Short mmCIF file of C-alpha atoms in Angstrom, two decimals:
data_model
loop_
_atom_site.label_atom_id
_atom_site.label_comp_id
_atom_site.label_asym_id
_atom_site.label_seq_id
_atom_site.Cartn_x
_atom_site.Cartn_y
_atom_site.Cartn_z
CA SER A 1 48.08 146.52 24.37
CA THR A 2 45.64 148.53 27.45
CA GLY A 3 41.66 147.53 27.71
CA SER A 4 39.44 149.72 29.72
CA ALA A 5 35.74 149.10 30.88
CA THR A 6 33.34 150.72 33.27
CA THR A 7 32.69 149.35 36.34
CA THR A 8 28.92 149.90 37.68
CA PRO A 9 27.88 149.38 41.33
CA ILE A 10 25.55 146.74 41.35
CA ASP A 11 23.07 148.05 43.99
CA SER A 12 22.19 151.66 45.42
CA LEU A 13 24.69 150.92 48.27
CA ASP A 14 27.80 150.19 46.27
CA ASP A 15 27.36 146.41 48.20
CA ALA A 16 29.66 145.37 44.70
CA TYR A 17 30.80 146.87 41.02
CA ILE A 18 30.20 144.23 38.18
CA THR A 19 31.91 144.76 34.76
CA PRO A 20 30.98 143.56 31.41
CA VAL A 21 33.73 140.90 29.91
CA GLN A 22 33.35 138.86 26.67
CA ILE A 23 34.20 135.39 27.14
CA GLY A 24 34.18 132.94 23.85
CA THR A 25 33.35 133.16 19.69
CA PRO A 26 31.25 134.94 19.29
CA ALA A 27 31.52 136.92 22.64
CA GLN A 28 28.67 135.85 25.12
CA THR A 29 29.20 139.24 27.79
CA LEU A 30 29.01 138.65 31.39
CA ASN A 31 29.12 141.13 34.26
CA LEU A 32 32.07 139.66 37.03
CA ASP A 33 32.90 140.79 39.98
CA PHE A 34 36.15 142.48 39.57
CA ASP A 35 37.98 140.73 42.55
CA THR A 36 41.98 142.02 43.55
CA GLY A 37 41.30 139.73 46.98
CA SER A 38 41.28 135.90 44.67
CA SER A 39 42.87 134.72 42.10
CA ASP A 40 39.74 132.68 40.21
CA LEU A 41 37.36 133.69 37.36
CA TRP A 42 34.98 132.09 37.64
CA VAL A 43 30.97 132.18 35.79
CA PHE A 44 28.01 130.71 36.26
CA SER A 45 27.56 128.48 33.30
CA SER A 46 25.23 126.45 31.25
CA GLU A 47 26.70 123.87 33.73
CA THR A 48 25.83 125.21 37.06
CA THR A 49 22.34 123.01 39.31
CA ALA A 50 19.68 125.11 37.26
CA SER A 51 17.74 125.33 40.55
CA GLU A 52 21.48 127.39 41.74
CA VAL A 53 20.60 129.74 38.83
CA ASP A 54 18.20 132.73 39.77
CA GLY A 55 18.69 135.61 36.83
CA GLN A 56 22.86 135.31 36.34
CA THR A 57 23.62 134.74 32.61
CA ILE A 58 25.27 131.80 31.71
CA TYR A 59 28.36 131.12 29.85
CA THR A 60 27.76 128.20 27.31
CA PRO A 61 30.85 127.02 26.29
CA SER A 62 28.92 124.58 24.17
CA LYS A 63 28.04 127.07 22.04
CA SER A 64 31.75 128.64 21.75
CA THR A 65 34.34 127.86 18.55
CA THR A 66 37.34 129.00 20.89
CA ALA A 67 36.17 126.78 24.22
CA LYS A 68 38.51 124.27 25.15
CA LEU A 69 37.56 121.68 27.97
CA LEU A 70 40.82 122.08 30.62
CA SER A 71 41.00 118.38 31.09
CA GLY A 72 41.04 116.87 34.19
CA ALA A 73 41.18 119.64 36.19
CA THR A 74 38.57 121.49 39.07
CA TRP A 75 38.95 124.04 41.01
CA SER A 76 36.35 125.09 44.52
CA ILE A 77 36.66 128.51 45.85
CA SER A 78 35.71 129.06 49.50
CA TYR A 79 35.37 133.58 50.46
CA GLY A 80 35.30 135.38 53.75
CA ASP A 81 31.90 135.79 54.01
CA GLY A 82 30.22 132.02 54.07
CA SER A 83 30.39 131.88 50.16
CA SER A 84 31.32 129.26 47.90
CA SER A 85 31.70 128.16 44.43
CA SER A 86 33.22 125.03 42.04
CA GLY A 87 33.07 123.04 38.96
CA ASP A 88 35.31 122.44 35.82
CA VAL A 89 37.31 124.65 33.73
CA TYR A 90 37.91 125.50 29.95
CA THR A 91 40.17 127.98 28.44
CA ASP A 92 38.45 130.44 25.78
CA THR A 93 39.29 133.89 24.65
CA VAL A 94 38.21 135.78 26.87
CA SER A 95 38.33 140.68 27.01
CA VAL A 96 37.72 143.71 28.92
CA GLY A 97 37.26 146.54 26.93
CA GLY A 98 39.48 145.77 24.36
CA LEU A 99 42.01 143.55 26.18
CA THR A 100 41.87 140.47 25.05
CA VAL A 101 43.84 137.28 26.20
CA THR A 102 43.19 133.94 24.20
CA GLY A 103 43.53 130.61 26.24
CA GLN A 104 42.00 131.79 29.82
CA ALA A 105 40.98 129.18 32.12
CA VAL A 106 37.53 129.94 33.03
CA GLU A 107 36.37 128.16 35.57
CA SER A 108 32.39 127.15 34.68
CA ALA A 109 30.52 126.72 37.82
CA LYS A 110 28.94 123.60 38.80
CA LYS A 111 27.65 124.41 41.91
CA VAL A 112 27.09 127.81 43.75
CA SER A 113 26.21 129.08 46.95
CA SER A 114 23.01 129.93 48.60
CA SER A 115 24.62 134.06 48.77
CA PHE A 116 25.31 133.49 44.73
CA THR A 117 22.34 132.24 43.50
CA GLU A 118 20.60 135.14 45.51
CA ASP A 119 22.50 138.11 43.73
CA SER A 120 20.76 138.12 40.11
CA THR A 121 23.58 141.02 39.12
CA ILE A 122 26.89 139.16 39.60
CA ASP A 123 26.79 136.13 37.01
CA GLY A 124 30.59 135.42 38.18
CA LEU A 125 34.43 137.02 39.64
CA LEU A 126 37.25 137.69 37.90
CA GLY A 127 40.29 137.59 39.64
CA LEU A 128 43.48 140.30 40.19
CA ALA A 129 45.49 139.04 43.27
CA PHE A 130 48.31 137.28 42.40
CA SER A 131 48.38 133.72 40.39
CA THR A 132 49.72 131.91 43.58
CA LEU A 133 46.11 131.48 45.17
CA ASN A 134 44.06 130.02 42.09
CA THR A 135 42.45 127.23 43.27
CA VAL A 136 42.82 125.05 39.97
CA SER A 137 43.79 121.45 40.45
CA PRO A 138 46.14 119.76 39.44
CA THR A 139 47.15 122.78 37.40
CA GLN A 140 46.83 125.66 38.76
CA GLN A 141 45.92 128.62 36.34
CA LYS A 142 47.07 132.08 35.48
CA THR A 143 44.95 134.97 36.06
CA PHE A 144 43.79 137.48 33.65
CA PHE A 145 45.95 140.35 34.13
CA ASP A 146 48.54 137.59 34.98
CA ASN A 147 48.15 136.61 31.35
CA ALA A 148 47.75 139.97 29.64
CA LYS A 149 50.62 141.46 31.67
CA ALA A 150 53.69 140.84 29.09
CA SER A 151 51.25 142.33 26.24
CA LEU A 152 50.55 145.47 28.06
CA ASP A 153 51.91 148.81 26.92
CA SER A 154 52.90 148.80 31.50
CA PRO A 155 52.19 146.23 33.90
CA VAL A 156 49.78 147.72 35.67
CA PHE A 157 45.98 147.58 36.25
CA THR A 158 44.52 151.05 38.09
CA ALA A 159 40.70 151.03 39.92
CA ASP A 160 38.28 154.28 40.02
CA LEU A 161 35.62 152.83 41.83
CA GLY A 162 32.58 155.18 41.92
CA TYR A 163 30.50 156.14 44.94
CA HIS A 164 26.87 155.13 43.83
CA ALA A 165 28.62 155.61 40.61
CA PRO A 166 30.54 154.41 37.52
CA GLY A 167 33.74 153.76 37.79
CA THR A 168 36.35 152.17 35.47
CA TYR A 169 39.38 149.44 35.30
CA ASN A 170 42.04 150.68 32.96
CA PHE A 171 44.82 147.40 31.84
CA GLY A 172 47.89 148.93 30.93
CA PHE A 173 48.20 152.78 31.03
CA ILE A 174 47.41 155.05 34.41
CA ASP A 175 45.46 158.13 33.11
CA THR A 176 47.06 161.30 34.81
CA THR A 177 43.06 163.11 34.17
CA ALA A 178 41.61 160.77 36.66
CA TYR A 179 43.24 161.56 39.80
CA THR A 180 44.46 164.81 41.61
CA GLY A 181 47.73 165.06 43.14
CA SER A 182 50.38 162.23 42.89
CA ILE A 183 49.92 158.63 43.36
CA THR A 184 51.78 157.55 46.03
CA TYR A 185 53.34 154.57 45.87
CA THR A 186 53.91 151.52 48.62
CA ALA A 187 55.33 148.30 49.14
CA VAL A 188 53.62 145.36 48.76
CA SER A 189 53.68 142.14 50.34
CA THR A 190 52.81 138.87 48.07
CA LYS A 191 53.84 136.03 50.52
CA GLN A 192 49.87 135.52 50.88
CA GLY A 193 48.83 135.98 47.36
CA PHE A 194 47.53 139.52 48.40
CA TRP A 195 47.84 143.16 47.60
CA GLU A 196 49.06 143.25 50.96
CA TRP A 197 50.63 146.42 52.12
CA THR A 198 51.35 149.01 55.31
CA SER A 199 48.88 151.65 55.82
CA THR A 200 50.77 154.14 58.02
CA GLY A 201 47.86 155.32 60.16
CA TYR A 202 44.38 157.21 60.49
CA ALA A 203 42.36 160.34 61.67
CA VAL A 204 38.76 160.76 62.03
CA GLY A 205 37.21 164.00 60.64
CA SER A 206 39.30 166.67 61.33
CA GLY A 207 40.55 164.56 64.51
CA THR A 208 44.38 164.36 65.27
CA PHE A 209 46.22 161.97 62.41
CA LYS A 210 47.50 158.62 64.17
CA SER A 211 50.53 157.09 62.84
CA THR A 212 50.07 153.38 63.11
CA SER A 213 50.90 151.01 61.17
CA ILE A 214 48.85 149.02 60.21
CA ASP A 215 48.48 146.11 57.43
CA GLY A 216 46.45 145.19 55.24
CA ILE A 217 44.99 144.02 51.83
CA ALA A 218 43.06 146.25 48.65
CA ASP A 219 40.55 143.76 48.44
CA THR A 220 37.53 145.42 45.80
CA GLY A 221 35.87 142.44 46.02
CA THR A 222 35.31 143.14 49.72
CA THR A 223 32.49 145.59 50.61
CA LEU A 224 33.50 147.33 53.28
CA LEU A 225 36.41 148.83 55.29
CA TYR A 226 37.57 146.27 57.32
CA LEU A 227 40.18 147.70 60.76
CA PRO A 228 41.46 146.51 64.09
CA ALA A 229 38.96 147.09 66.87
CA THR A 230 40.85 150.32 68.64
CA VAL A 231 40.55 152.27 65.15
CA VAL A 232 37.19 151.45 64.63
CA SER A 233 36.06 151.86 68.05
CA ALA A 234 37.54 155.33 67.65
CA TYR A 235 35.46 156.10 64.85
CA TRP A 236 32.88 154.95 66.00
CA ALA A 237 32.99 156.86 68.83
CA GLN A 238 32.29 160.31 67.22
CA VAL A 239 28.94 159.09 65.81
CA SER A 240 26.12 159.57 68.44
CA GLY A 241 24.56 156.40 69.78
CA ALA A 242 26.62 154.10 67.77
CA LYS A 243 27.21 150.96 69.15
CA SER A 244 28.64 147.94 68.59
CA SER A 245 26.10 145.09 67.81
CA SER A 246 26.19 141.22 68.65
CA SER A 247 23.11 140.59 67.45
CA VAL A 248 23.70 142.79 63.72
CA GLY A 249 27.03 141.57 63.23
CA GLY A 250 28.72 144.94 63.82
CA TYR A 251 28.29 148.80 64.23
CA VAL A 252 25.38 150.13 63.70
CA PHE A 253 24.67 153.59 64.10
CA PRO A 254 21.67 155.74 63.72
CA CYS A 255 20.00 156.84 60.45
CA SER A 256 19.78 160.23 61.76
CA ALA A 257 23.39 161.09 62.00
CA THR A 258 26.19 162.95 59.94
CA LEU A 259 28.86 160.67 59.97
CA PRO A 260 32.62 161.80 59.92
CA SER A 261 35.55 161.27 56.99
CA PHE A 262 37.83 158.62 57.75
CA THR A 263 41.20 159.39 56.63
CA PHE A 264 43.71 156.60 55.63
CA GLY A 265 47.50 157.04 54.85
CA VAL A 266 50.00 155.96 51.83
CA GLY A 267 53.01 156.45 53.07
CA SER A 268 53.13 160.94 53.99
CA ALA A 269 50.08 161.22 51.48
CA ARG A 270 46.62 160.52 52.87
CA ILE A 271 43.23 159.27 51.81
CA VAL A 272 39.89 160.96 52.49
CA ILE A 273 37.30 158.88 52.71
CA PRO A 274 33.55 160.75 53.11
CA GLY A 275 31.88 159.91 56.21
CA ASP A 276 28.89 159.77 53.10
CA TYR A 277 30.73 156.61 52.38
CA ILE A 278 30.57 154.87 55.52
CA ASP A 279 26.47 154.40 55.72
CA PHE A 280 25.68 151.09 54.55
CA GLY A 281 21.91 152.25 55.04
CA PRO A 282 18.97 150.33 57.08
CA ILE A 283 20.19 147.13 58.76
CA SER A 284 16.78 145.98 57.60
CA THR A 285 13.76 147.21 55.46
CA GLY A 286 12.08 150.58 57.14
CA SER A 287 14.43 150.13 60.39
CA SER A 288 16.16 153.91 61.65
CA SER A 289 18.85 151.48 62.41
CA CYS A 290 22.15 151.91 59.66
CA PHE A 291 24.67 148.99 59.43
CA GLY A 292 28.35 151.26 59.61
CA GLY A 293 30.91 151.11 56.13
CA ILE A 294 33.99 150.66 58.93
CA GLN A 295 34.11 147.10 60.89
CA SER A 296 36.59 145.74 62.99
CA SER A 297 38.70 143.22 61.18
CA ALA A 298 39.08 141.22 64.90
CA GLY A 299 37.11 137.38 63.47
CA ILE A 300 39.27 138.05 59.65
CA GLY A 301 42.75 137.43 61.04
CA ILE A 302 43.54 140.84 58.26
CA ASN A 303 42.98 144.27 58.03
CA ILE A 304 40.90 144.84 54.22
CA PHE A 305 40.77 148.18 52.58
CA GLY A 306 37.82 147.10 51.01
CA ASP A 307 35.55 149.15 48.75
CA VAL A 308 34.74 151.48 51.10
CA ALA A 309 38.44 152.98 50.98
CA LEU A 310 39.13 151.88 47.63
CA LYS A 311 36.03 154.26 45.95
CA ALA A 312 38.01 157.11 47.91
CA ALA A 313 41.01 157.12 45.73
CA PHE A 314 42.19 156.31 42.05
CA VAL A 315 44.72 152.62 43.02
CA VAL A 316 47.34 151.33 40.78
CA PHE A 317 47.93 147.65 40.79
CA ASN A 318 51.46 147.51 39.89
CA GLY A 319 52.46 143.87 38.73
CA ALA A 320 55.86 144.88 37.67
CA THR A 321 58.95 142.00 38.85
CA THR A 322 58.45 143.83 42.04
CA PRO A 323 54.76 145.04 42.72
CA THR A 324 53.98 147.85 44.16
CA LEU A 325 50.52 150.18 45.31
CA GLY A 326 49.85 153.25 43.98
CA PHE A 327 46.88 155.66 45.57
CA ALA A 328 45.71 159.09 44.82
CA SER A 329 42.45 161.46 45.52
CA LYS A 330 40.78 161.90 43.07
#
């Protein structure tokens, strides 16, 4: 089997991407944030505290003939941004663009933190990291991909995120028309539950490529590119007036600047992030100071190849017995 669904930026800055997902019978379509950095499929629901729902579409398990409460199961998750959610669990039928999993754990939110309530465009998350990170207790549950893997033509999914434009998640096949050149595959460590890999270096604009190992995770659920402070300083040094602001929480730059590209290494191959992809706009409405899309990972404990980096590539999440990651230019 295969599936294919279009993923769309939620706003003009590509702050996140939403993909329609059909849950239950008859189908209830929710727009979920596909997140290769987490492993819970959770949704706003008829059980979510009413004051914490503000425009999201909700899953109502009582209206689904295939929903069954997973008795005694609860979930609770916290994300890198200070955000949190928790609730109970149903199993139900879940489909993504033609690909159907029966008995998928659908985690129904009873509580969500402020940042989720305040984002009316995201109805929940669909985790695509390894199932070892799933938070359901006392019986950990499998991700949508884990449940679908055996039925797929090939045990893979691909992320083709667009810059200020729609893109595609495919399950079970590699669309060889979607990228240029070849796909370079690179080893993955699953020990932390992430798609964790090692970039071979970087370049700033047309500058010299620096060969240096950068361990990090491929995370479609993180907006920006978080890299070591030395690398980030080298990048912003090329932007007149750019500076790290402790008040704002990262590197800012004059909105009038034209940003250089940033290249990262995948084995001997190179992925080029155009400068425009690194502009996240005014720090507050009407400001002439703009927020940078490359930021230091110092206060994270891990480097994160988030959407800023991944959208510059066609990315293969290969879930074979020994998982690997593939990157192609596009």
